[PDB]
Nucleic acid binder design. Sequence first.
DNA 1: TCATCGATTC
DNA 2: GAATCGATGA
Length: 145
Amino acid sequence: EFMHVFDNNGIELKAECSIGEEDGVYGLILESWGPGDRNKDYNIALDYIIERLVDSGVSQVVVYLASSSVRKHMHSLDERKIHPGEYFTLIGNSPRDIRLKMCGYQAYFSRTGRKEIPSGNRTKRILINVPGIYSDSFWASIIRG
DNA sequence: TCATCGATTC
DNA sequence: GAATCGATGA
């Protein structure tokens, strides 16, 4: 029922995802890692996604916190946007370093709202949007590799 | 049973 | 500072 991210050799990663419209935004949902081994390839998969997005000519995305807890308690979509600006930039560093920065922002969320000091898990359910992209074919080629 | 992120280990 | 574990409440 879930799709998955595949590595550069075409092997399926432990990283569930899905493509579609959620809360009015079209894009890729990456499921959370945990407990134990559930989606344990989250970071690897996310590095591949960033790398392939950059390769396809995408330089900026919008990323929203999409956990059940945050969707329930934070009704504003603008507040679920994990990064302070309108967009998050994918170029200017390695896919890994870009990912570290992207996921660092996830640590500013608790179950019920934002924190002052960031802490905790950084492998949460997230929605990634590429402005102007409304089609599953584009996202399909990103996760397929 | 289950996804949540705080807590612990790296 | 970040990867991984696993206690927790719905």
